[PDB]
């Protein structure tokens, strides 16, 4: 494994580096590749014989080498860039490759964005199987960090709740969601359920009336 | 319109073989040398192997005893093999095109190449030349080659969609689709949020498009929850401007561990 920081950061329009540390069995052999892993897509070849651009790809990403220590240099940083990068190499033989242990790019100075919040309650098609899923969608929000509270009648509930990572959706933000899992009893016995999605100290919170639906 | 596309089960038991194929279209395995690279999920990519033109097989030294790669020129396929598989096998595999040439390339300088009657000789000049005859040329200019010095060059010219496979000893599980839609009072849009909660499967993964794919914008897709029953679930939304009446809504479900197919109706609930 070749050796690569787990993550490095920069900030939008600037410059960042990411170095790939190996032996003189690998990199000092003198044939470097990158790749670029955005998740939900399959990964994308950024530079190959250590400085060559592949096809498609902006002289705004440009590779290099020293000795047996590569360098990925990606200058105007835009949204688009956070993603996982992993440098790659041949040794001993050209069918035998070693991948670098990746490293992940957040791009800071991009502007904040609330969570937008969808609160949804269970359908009758589950209702009839005698369980109830409330479901809370949270979408649009940078950066990816949220915390989800669920409660009922206003008091804190602290079982049944399962919440995602957040993760990128189209337009460079966030996206998450939580499940609130009841039985069909629950969900008609309180008044009232909220998903209360706090990001960046605001917070959000969506009601849901078993009685109004 | 060069195309890689991977096929097999999403789904195979522990000790047993995993068996993929890669049908390759617009272009000639003769011409291409194809390999294989995973990715375990949170793990970084692995290297497991190719077959060239000649039909040389290479593996990751590592891996090759567990790993089997063959192909057939005029159906275009190349098949790999995982022998003995565990839950450390579980990943995302990708059928690609490889470059993979072997070279000599000397110290940093001596980029040019220069075989005479004397030996082999890494040269800084790209005359072979006036530093073949002499021999006070090539020790100036050149350096001579070893016989045993090579160099290896390998990268990824395209990759494939890949083939995510699970690991796992579990029974498959078809999911439920169930709509989504806002309770009655929350009607007042501007635009009218909806989805589908496909609840309850196993393994990943699971496609939704809505409307058959003709309804693309507005469509956001969640990653899937893994509840502590092991059954997947995730939800998928659309958002639309309302009103939108005349129009249906549809989210169309995909599960190919068990070749199920659900198309399921989402209507507003009407109160």
Redesign the interface.
Same mark, same amino acid.
């Given at each position: 494994?070749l050796n690569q920081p787990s993550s490095v950061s920069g900030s939008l329009g600037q410059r960042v580096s990411i170095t790939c540390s190996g032996s003189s069995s690998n990199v000092g052999? $003198?044939?470097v590749?990158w790749?670029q @892993?955005i998740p939900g897509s399959?990964?994308?070849?950024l530079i190959?014989?250590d400085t060559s651009r592949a096809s498609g790809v902006p002289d705004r990403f440009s590779g290099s080498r020293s000795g047996n220590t590569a360098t990925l240099t990606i200058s105007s940083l835009q949204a688009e860039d956070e993603a996982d990068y992993?440098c790659?190499?041949?040794? *001993?033989?050209?069918?035998?490759? %070693?991948? $670098?242990?990746?490293t992940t790019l957040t791009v800071l100075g991009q502007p904040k964005s609330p969570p937008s919040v969808? @609160?949804?309650?269970?359908?009758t !098609? !589950?209702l009839n199987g005698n369980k109830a899923?409330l %479901?809370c #969608?949270i979408?649009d929000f940078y950066p990816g960090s949220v915390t989800v509270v669920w409660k009922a009648d206003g008091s804190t509930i602290t079982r049944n709740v399962? =919440? =995602?990572?957040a993760?990128k &959706?189209?337009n460079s933000k966030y996206?998450?969601?939580s499940?609130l899992?009841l039985t069909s009893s629950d969900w008609k016995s309180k008044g009232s359920y909220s998903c209360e999605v706090t990001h960046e100290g605001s917070t959000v919170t969506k009601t %849901?009336?078993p009685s109004?639906? | 319109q060069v195309q890689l596309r991977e096929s097999g089960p999403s789904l195979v038991k522990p000790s047993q073989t995993l068996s993929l194929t890669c049908t390759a279209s617009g272009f000639s395995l003769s011409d291409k040398a194809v $390999?294989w690279?995973r990715?375990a999920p949170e793990k970084? +990519? !692995?290297?497991l192997?190719?077959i060239?033109t000649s039909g040389?097989?290479?593996?990751?030294?590592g891996l090759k005893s567990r790993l089997s790669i063959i192909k057939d020129n005029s159906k275009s396929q190349v098949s790999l093999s995982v022998s003995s598989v565990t839950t450390e096998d579980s990943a995302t595999y990708?059928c690609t095109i490889v470059? &993979?040439?072997?070279?000599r390339?000397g110290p *940093?300088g001596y980029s040019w190449i220069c075989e005479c009657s004397s030996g082999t000789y890494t040269c800084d000049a790209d005359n072979c030349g006036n530093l073949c005859p002499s021999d006070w040329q090539l020790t100036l200019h050149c350096h001579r080659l070893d016989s045993s010095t090579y160099?290896? *060059?390998?990268?990824? !010219?395209t990759?494939? &969609?890949?083939l995510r496979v699970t690991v796992s000893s579990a029974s498959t599980t078809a999911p439920?689709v169930?709509? +989504?839609?806002?309770?009655? $009072?929350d009607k007042s849009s501007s635009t009218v =949020?909806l989805?589908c #909660?496909v609840?309850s499967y196993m393994p990943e993964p699971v496609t939704v498009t809505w409307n058959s794919g003709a309804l693309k914008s507005g469509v956001?897709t969640?990653?899937?929850?893994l &509840?502590s029953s092991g059954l997947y679930?995730?939800?998928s939304?659309v958002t639309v401007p309302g009103s939108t009446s005349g129009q249906t809504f549809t989210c169309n479900v995909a599960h190919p561990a068990s070749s199920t197919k659900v198309d399921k109706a989402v209507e507003p609930?009407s109160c």
């Open positions: 494994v052999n $003198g044939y590749s790749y @892993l399959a990964p994308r070849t190959y014989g992993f790659a190499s041949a040794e *001993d033989s050209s069918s035998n490759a %070693v991948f $670098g242990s990746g969808t @609160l949804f309650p269970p359908s !098609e !589950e899923t %479901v #969608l979408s399962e =919440t =995602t990572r993760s &959706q189209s996206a998450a969601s499940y899992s %849901v009336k109004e639906c | $390999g690279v990715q970084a +990519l !692995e290297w192997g190719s060239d040389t097989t290479g593996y990751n030294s990708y470059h &993979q040439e072997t070279s390339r *940093d160099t290896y *060059d390998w990268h990824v !010219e990759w494939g &969609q890949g439920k169930y709509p +989504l839609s806002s309770c009655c $009072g =949020t989805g #909660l609840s956001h969640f990653p899937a929850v &509840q679930s995730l939800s939304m609930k």
